[PDB]
Design an enzyme around this catalytic site. Structure first.
Site, PDB file in Angstrom:
ATOM      1  N   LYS A   1     -12.549   0.468  -5.704  1.00 26.80           N
ATOM      2  CA  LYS A   1     -11.698   1.309  -5.751  1.00 26.80           C
ATOM      3  C   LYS A   1     -11.153   1.607  -7.244  1.00 26.80           C
ATOM      4  O   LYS A   1     -10.743   2.795  -7.653  1.00 26.80           O
ATOM      5  CB  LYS A   1     -10.365   0.878  -5.022  1.00 26.80           C
ATOM      6  CG  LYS A   1      -9.578   2.005  -4.640  1.00 26.80           C
ATOM      7  CD  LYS A   1      -8.385   1.436  -3.701  1.00 26.80           C
ATOM      8  CE  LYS A   1      -7.220   2.330  -3.603  1.00 26.80           C
ATOM      9  NZ  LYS A   1      -6.293   1.754  -2.798  1.00 26.80           N
TER      10      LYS A   1
ATOM     11  N   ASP B   1      -5.912   1.477   5.709  1.00 29.39           N
ATOM     12  CA  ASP B   1      -5.601   1.308   4.414  1.00 29.39           C
ATOM     13  C   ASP B   1      -6.756   0.616   3.708  1.00 29.39           C
ATOM     14  O   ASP B   1      -7.312  -0.617   4.189  1.00 29.39           O
ATOM     15  CB  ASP B   1      -4.375   0.376   4.536  1.00 29.39           C
ATOM     16  CG  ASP B   1      -4.051  -0.199   3.081  1.00 29.39           C
ATOM     17  OD1 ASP B   1      -4.512   0.122   1.993  1.00 29.39           O
ATOM     18  OD2 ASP B   1      -2.906  -1.134   3.063  1.00 29.39           O
TER      19      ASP B   1
ATOM     20  N   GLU C   1      -0.724   6.535  -0.102  1.00 28.51           N
ATOM     21  CA  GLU C   1      -0.448   5.294   0.331  1.00 28.51           C
ATOM     22  C   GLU C   1       1.237   5.188   0.656  1.00 28.51           C
ATOM     23  O   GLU C   1       1.853   4.979   1.528  1.00 28.51           O
ATOM     24  CB  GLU C   1      -0.770   4.001  -0.421  1.00 28.51           C
ATOM     25  CG  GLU C   1      -2.086   3.739  -0.246  1.00 28.51           C
ATOM     26  CD  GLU C   1      -2.901   3.093  -1.588  1.00 28.51           C
ATOM     27  OE1 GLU C   1      -2.075   2.649  -2.319  1.00 28.51           O
ATOM     28  OE2 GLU C   1      -4.232   3.315  -1.663  1.00 28.51           O
TER      29      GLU C   1
ATOM     30  N   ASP D   1       5.531  -1.094  -4.401  1.00 26.55           N
ATOM     31  CA  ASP D   1       4.281  -1.536  -3.944  1.00 26.55           C
ATOM     32  C   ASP D   1       3.978  -2.459  -4.958  1.00 26.55           C
ATOM     33  O   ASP D   1       3.071  -2.122  -6.101  1.00 26.55           O
ATOM     34  CB  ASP D   1       3.171  -0.334  -3.802  1.00 26.55           C
ATOM     35  CG  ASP D   1       1.892  -0.665  -3.270  1.00 26.55           C
ATOM     36  OD1 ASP D   1       1.512  -1.985  -3.274  1.00 26.55           O
ATOM     37  OD2 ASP D   1       1.330   0.380  -3.114  1.00 26.55           O
TER      38      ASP D   1
HETATM   39 MG   LIG Z   1      -2.039  -1.295  -1.165  1.00 25.64          MG
END
Ligand SMILES: [Mg+2]
Ligand SMILES: Nc1ncnc2c1nc(Br)n2[C@@H]1O[C@H](CO)[C@@H](O)[C@H]1O
Length: 390
Positions: free
Chosen positions: A73, A12, A177, A201
């Protein structure tokens, strides 16, 4: 005849924290790093003598802000002109430069000014996750599944693969994800018939809601919604502002101009915030915070919940938008999955459960580990090479 194959890993690669897992003996092991942490900061620091990655980079950020890189990211696969990039640059202490309309991070490293592409910084984080895994397995690791957000375009997905290749990994697949969190619960192994799954999330800096449909193990992303300005750091900011005011009332002193005192306060607030997820109250004990005054105080879970109340309620707006976009009713959702450390907050869980009329939430897999867990499950499936029997 045929030598035993090394295990493949699931990574991840997160914006703030990264996590690595391996599926062995019919189960996933989330692998702790050499400091005993099951998640590793996605930070890279540069000095005259070393390049530090993970906990070592995050632990020295206070005195080296210009040469400690985080949030790569947010830059990966994007153009320098992109409005997202330009706005984000105002919040970062490190330099972001323009190289052919592609962003690069520029630092002092080993006596020189060096610029890196975001995929090169991400490759350094991936090298650390590969080493964490090889320390546990006791042999070199080659194969990995890496996850990305569902909204990532082709360029963002290719730059993620490129980071994997620079790190010396064979990237088996780039998976979404929310799909990885669903796989972690075996939600693709429930047989024939359509299932609607909502993934909630809540990260350190952003909030994402995804609606997936699963039919015979086939995943389809039905809707995505979220809030780019909602995360764990906003709840930390609310506690910081509360305690700055408290010190002012109690000692008639404004601490907000001593960066060290603010940083020590914020570090303490983040830990108190974590304690409040398991306890109904938490203590805050800082020695010589400002002008040799010790700050020994407390905060109840009820007061913290009041301080962040508007922020917690605002997580339901993207949920309703995602349900409208998917053209579904809340009763039509079969499974609710929690992702991100901020989902441990009891009030966040209560608001969402109340919204879905008391339905149970899947939170049995540590929410900060569920994405790597599903990626490790997928990695073991992808390396299988069974030959059919007669
Ligand atoms: Mg995450
Ligand atoms: N137990 C927990 N209760 C409340 N919050 C938590 C917890 N554990 C984690 Br991890 N967090 C927060 O999750 C975010 C991950 O980037 C950060 O803001 C962490 O502070």
């Amino acid at each position: 005849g045929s030598m035993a194959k090394a295990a493949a890993i699931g990574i991840d690669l997160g914006t703030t924290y990264s996590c690595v897992g391996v599926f062995q003996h019919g189960k996933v092991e989330i692998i702790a790093n050499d400091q005993g942490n099951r998640t590793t900061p996605s930070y890279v620091a540069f000095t005259d003598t070393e390049r530090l990655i993970g906990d070592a980079a995050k632990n020295q950020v206070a005195l080296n802000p210009q040469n400690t890189v985080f949030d790569a990211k947010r830059l990966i696969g994007r153009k320098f002109g992109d409005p997202v990039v330009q706005s984000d640059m105002k919040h970062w202490p490190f330099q972001v430069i323009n190289d052919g309309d592609k962003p690069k991070v520029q630092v002092s490293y080993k006596g020189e000014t060096k610029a890196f592409y975001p995929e090169e910084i991400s490759s350094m984080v991936l090298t650390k996750m590969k080493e964490i895994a090889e320390a546990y397995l006791g042999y070199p690791v080659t194969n990995a599944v890496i996850t990305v957000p569902a909204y990532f375009n082709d360029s963002q997905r290719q730059a993620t693969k490129d980071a994997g290749v620079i790190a010396g990994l064979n990237v088996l697949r780039i998976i979404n994800e929310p799909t990885a969190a669903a796989i972690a619960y075996g939600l693709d192994r429930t047989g024939k018939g359509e299932r609607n799954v909502l993934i909630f999330d809540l990260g350190g800096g952003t909030f994402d809601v995804s609606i997936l449909t699963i039919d015979d193990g086939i995943f389809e992303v039905k809707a995505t919604a979220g809030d780019t300005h909602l995360g764990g750091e906003d709840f930390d900011n609310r506690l910081v502002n509360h305690f700055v005011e408290e010190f002012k009332r109690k000692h008639k002193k404004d601490i907000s101009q001593n960066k060290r005192a603010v940083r020590r306060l914020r570090t303490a607030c983040e830990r108190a915030k974590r304690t409040l997820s398991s306890s109904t109250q938490a203590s805050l004990e800082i020695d010589s915070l400002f002008e040799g005054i010790d700050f020994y105080t407390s905060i109840t879970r009820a007061r913290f919940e009041e301080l962040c109340s508007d922020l917690f309620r605002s997580t339901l707006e993207p949920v309703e938008k995602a349900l409208r976009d998917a053209k579904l009713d809340k009763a039509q959702i079969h499974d609710l999955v929690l992702v991100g450390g901020s989902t441990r907050i009891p009030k966040v869980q209560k608001l969402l459960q109340d919204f879905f009329n008391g339905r149970d939430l899947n939170k049995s897999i540590n929410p900060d580990e569920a994405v790597a867990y599903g990626a490790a499950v997928q990695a073991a499936i992808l390396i299988k090479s069974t030959r059919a029997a007669a």
